[PDB]
Symmetry: D2
Subunit: 228 residues, 4 copies
Amino acid sequence: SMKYILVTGGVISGIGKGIIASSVGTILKSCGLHVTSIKIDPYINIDNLTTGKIYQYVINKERKGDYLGKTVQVVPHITDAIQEWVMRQALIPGLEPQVCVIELGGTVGDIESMPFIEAFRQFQFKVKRENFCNIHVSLVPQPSGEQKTKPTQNSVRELRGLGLSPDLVVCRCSNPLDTSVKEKISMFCHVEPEQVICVHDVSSIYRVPLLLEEQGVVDYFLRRLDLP
Amino acid sequence: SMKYILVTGGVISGIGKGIIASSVGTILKSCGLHVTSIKIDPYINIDNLTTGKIYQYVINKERKGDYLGKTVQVVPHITDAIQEWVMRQALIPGLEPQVCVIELGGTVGDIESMPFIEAFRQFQFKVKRENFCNIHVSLVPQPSGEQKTKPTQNSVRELRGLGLSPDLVVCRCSNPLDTSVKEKISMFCHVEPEQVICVHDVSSIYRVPLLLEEQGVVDYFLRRLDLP
Amino acid sequence: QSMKYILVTGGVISGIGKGIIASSVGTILKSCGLHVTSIKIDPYINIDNNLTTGKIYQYVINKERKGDYLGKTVQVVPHITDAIQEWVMRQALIPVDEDGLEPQVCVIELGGTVGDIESMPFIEAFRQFQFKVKRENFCNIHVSLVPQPSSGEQKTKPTQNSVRELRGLGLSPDLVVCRCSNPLDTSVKEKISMFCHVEPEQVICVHDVSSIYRVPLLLEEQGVVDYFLRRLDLP
Amino acid sequence: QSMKYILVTGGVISGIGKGIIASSVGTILKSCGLHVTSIKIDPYINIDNNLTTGKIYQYVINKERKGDYLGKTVQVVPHITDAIQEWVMRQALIPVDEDGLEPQVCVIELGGTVGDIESMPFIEAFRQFQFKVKRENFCNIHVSLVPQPSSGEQKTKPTQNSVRELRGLGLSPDLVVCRCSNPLDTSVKEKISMFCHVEPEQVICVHDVSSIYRVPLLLEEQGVVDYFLRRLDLP
């Protein structure tokens, strides 16, 4: 049965969910794991899953009486759609994908992503625990000069309330995170210090995979998801 | 130019937004004011404004290139739709309606109502201040035995953050609110004590209008909205 | 075996019945012949075995005044929250028995309502405490209100909101205890189960009863004692 | 004429430049020949004209111990929050001048970051204070961060979230002051304007400057002095 990594973002946009999501795909592909991808775009466009897509799906489903005359809502009707859609895709490569990485676009706290964050809150409990993961990418600012953790505290705090607890907390730095600083992120985000990852400003994006690998993200995933 | 009363709900459903919304319509109609109604149903059905209705509107608008190839979102695209829709209806009776009462269905905090609460947050600033109102209906529980205010504090607190400050706070009691208790609701909800209204368990729904009238809701509205 | 902690917290309204629940958990565990101890925390400034805000602040205030924090800035977090955990640890250890062994379980009643300013230090205190003492030995009961208007259906919103809030503050209930007037339908408690993160078996109904003494009986009937044994690996 | 209050609060990150802004508002008003006074509040336990948490708690603790609350339960709210308002009132009144008239304006620097546990009593204190002293005489500046990643656009989310939070805690900024590295586009500040509830003219840019002494000049250039005269009806 499918293994899932969800990648959510906090604090701001342009934080690098794309790069971490691909990097995690690449590190995983390089263990003989057949990995696959879903990009969720919370925007209303019908053009990979979008809000308009899943809404129009449910909207005309109702319009032809699939819901039997009773009132259709975000929970469970939209949220089920999203969860079913995810599972259909996780299967598409003729050997099936073993792990699936879900890039959730937008930022946690956004109104557009509320349905999607709720869908996955429900989904972690549907699939087993050993089959679902949550990587939260957040900004650790630093004006020259100490590295500031509160934005990530609050972001992780928000996501916890919305029902997901991050399993790694990947932090966008400029200079690497000091031990003390990620030990502080640990204190407040519930993960252990090794599960706080700094992806600092590397001069090129091909490093991010190596930057992830060497902070033990390969090893963690195998243990966390149970993987050959 | 149109005057608007928005009626939102807090704490629980079945609180009586329907009854207060109609009562306010009735008290207002009985001053030679031509009053009109919008019922917003945050549910996905396309059958008075609903989520499915406003989404399908925007969805196929985009699908025929009205939005010029750029990404459509809840803010401003859905929220504009909602605001424009509201104004079109406020005009439909051949003398035009002077005041319009918007029943916002669901409960504040719900994911389904987030777009609608944001639409009106923006709308209060679009129309003038003397043309827009917000009535928040909340539960004041009481197990036999003191009347409990926190649910309303938190509900009003939530709505304030989401960008609307209530102008009256109508409280569903079983027994009338004690002066001290609505003086406490005043302390935390920013309104003055006279703007806290208790609509307690009356033996019939035709009293609610009289219950509202005698707590000065007629007089307040004239002053708050500037009305003949 | 190491100390086991049961934290009782309240949501939605005060006077929801924390104290009674706290006492009933104490009684029903004690009934198994466990050696149970009890700690009350009032989040008020008034200055045992009964912690209060003023008691804790004065403690940390005095320490700082006497140099104990080595001239560093002293703060609600970590310094007040450290004091709250230190105190709970110490009291929990004191005997309360026929003869002097450490208690096996300590039921903590936290006053106030989740979300209140006055209870924020305490929730945070215990958010950290659950990781210090391992989660195997920590356990949180959240008492909430399920209104039932005659305008027939049993409302779960307040519980949903209160447990979202508590979650975000960093504690996720192990048992959700609902005060309501009639007993909850299975579906209503499967809905709470869904939204909070507990199995339906861990949504406990405490409906209107003839006497407060029927409440420990209500709890036993809904399998709580067996829950705590399984959950905190008690004998 | 009656005392005028300017409250400076911080969001998103600490070290965002509250103190500098607070000082610059003091300087630029003083430059108009107003008699301005300054109050610092550190939300720490360490025990002027400089309020601290331990100072306030010890105050209320002592009072209760000596019976001043007539045997009633004493709480963060209203009792600590009463103390914070009482103190601000008293200090604000003390002269700071060539000769002894009451100050015309009092700039209050609140330490901490909106959302922190340690600052909750204070925000609440001032939520109530704005209605006691009328809103005509009360005025809140919120300093926030606007990150600018090279991955070109100036980010408003953190400000949006921080002002939602502050709003909900019961203060709505009159001026939003953005720390960022370059100056903000008009559109970026119209966006903040939209989300928070201020006109674009009241979104103030404080970008990277050669010296801290250029910051009062930055403020004057963006019309703040004229804002405060209009907003607090000062001469």
